[PDB]
Amino acid sequence: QYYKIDTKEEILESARTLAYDMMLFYKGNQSGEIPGILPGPPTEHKGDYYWWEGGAMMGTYVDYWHLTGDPSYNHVIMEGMLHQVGPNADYQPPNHTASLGNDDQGFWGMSAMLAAENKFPNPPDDKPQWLALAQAVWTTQASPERHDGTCNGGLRWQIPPTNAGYNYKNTIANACFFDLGARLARYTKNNTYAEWAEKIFDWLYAVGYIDHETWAVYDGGHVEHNCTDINRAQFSYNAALLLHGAAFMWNYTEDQKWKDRVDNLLTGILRDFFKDGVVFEIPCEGRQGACTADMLTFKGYVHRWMAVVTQIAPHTKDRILPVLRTSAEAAVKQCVGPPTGRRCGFYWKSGKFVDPSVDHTSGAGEAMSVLAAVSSLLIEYAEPPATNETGISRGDPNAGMRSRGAAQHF
Ligand SMILES: N[C@@H]1[C@@H](O)[C@H](O)[C@@H](CO)O[C@@H]1O
Ligand SMILES: [Ca+2]
């Protein structure tokens, strides 16, 4: 094993080296390149990664600085986050229409929310501010044309009606909107965010994407079948994102129903995704060559989000932190690949380095996931998410409501 994680100082050093190796994949700060994205999209043969994964990377580094205190990458990350906001400061840049799912937009909004929660340095005065960006994403996702009567509600996966997948109402789109609403409620103390979060969670439960008996979290269903053709694939990030949002709602409302939802979601996650203490991507990890670029990132989000759950729902700490520790130990045990002696693969439970080429990418998602897992080992030393009581960001009462906003020509 190359990385050591047995003391705070060892974790900090390992996380710093992991942050370096992940950054080697990113070219957006170099002359002639585009800030905020990893190489891609594969549809243009420019690289392996889609736009939303750039947004996920930005958030991973906002968390990295929050957890470690290392500001080395903060200027690169600020540049990337600001470059992708679009003309209406809503993370809907029209050049990226083909990638404009509600989840894709949502992940950028969640990175902006995280920047506000973590007191990440503010953009210049003339540029969109982190809270305002999160508010704009949430507001566009609450817009009436995104909430029709099919399946009695819920967001569709895609924003443009002509995008493939507009007929799929999936968990992740709804989970992103839920999570944003719960987090905006806690930060701003505005109850309208919370009422929408409640509504969307209740929809996910009613439609049966949350299993009423086991609290497994399925993938979605199609409008032409009234959402009854449930795709029962269980992706780790769907259950973990609902757990995260539910924890924010528990912290904000102190309503026992939310504590029960946290506990039930958590029981399900530990049962389904943790194998002998190691996170495992059950729909694809069971054999090599099946996980897509998107799926290689999910276990990193699981780690970072579950770590935050322990701060805002502290009764969960003893159930979560020991399991994240064993999962991160497995992550680092397999970061031993050539040519560096520290290259990271994905198959943590297996105990062995597998070249990311088996899953047809250069390995950025695997690197991101190990960075997230190791950094989040420092959660016990970190401040909890800030609210507007101590945060430094600024909001916008008209976020998402500009006259040139895309909803005005839907
Ligand atoms: N429109 C979809 C996005 O929502 C999705 O995230 C990417 C990656 O799967 O493929 C397409 O671009
Ligand atoms: Ca490829």
* Residue 30 to residues 79, 150, 365, Cα–Cα distance (Å): 11, 46, 21
Alpha-helix runs per DSSP H in 189-213:
191-207
| Domains: count for the chain | 1
Buried b (16+ CB within 10 A) or exposed e, 94-110: eebebbbbbbbbbbbbb
In a domain, 3, yes or no: no
In a domain, 330, yes or no: yes
- Residues with C-beta less than 6 Å from any ligand 1 atom: 50, 52, 98-99, 101, 104, 158, 163, 294
In a domain, 2, yes or no: no
In a domain, 249, yes or no: yes
Q: Which residues pair with 101 in a beta bridge?
A: 158
In a domain, 1, yes or no: no
The ligand minimizing its distance to the Cα of 103 is 1
CB 334 within 8 A of CB 350: yes
How many Å apart are CA 293 and CA 290, to the nearest integer? 10
For residue 337, the domain's CATH number is 1.50.10.20
Sequence length of the chain is 410
How many Å apart are CA 57 and CA 77, to the nearest integer? 9
CA of 165 to the centre of ligand 1 (A): 9
Ligand 1 probe mutation, 49, 50, 219, most atoms within 8 A of CB: 50
Q: Which of 111, 95, 117, 131 is nearest to 53 (CA)?
A: 111
In a domain, 311, yes or no: yes
Ligand 1, atom 3, lies closest to the CA of: 99
Residue 360 labelled as part of a binding site: yes
In a domain, 222, yes or no: yes
In a domain, 403, yes or no: yes
Query: What atom in ligand 1 is closest to the CA of residue 292?
Result: 9
CB 241 within 8 A of CB 265: no
Q: What is the residue range of 352's domain? A: 8-408
Query: What atom in ligand 1 is closest to the CA of residue 163?
Result: 1
Structure's resolution in angstroms: 1.3
Q: What are 25's two structure tokens?
A: 């994949």
Handedness of CA 144, 146, 147, 149 (dihedral sign): positive
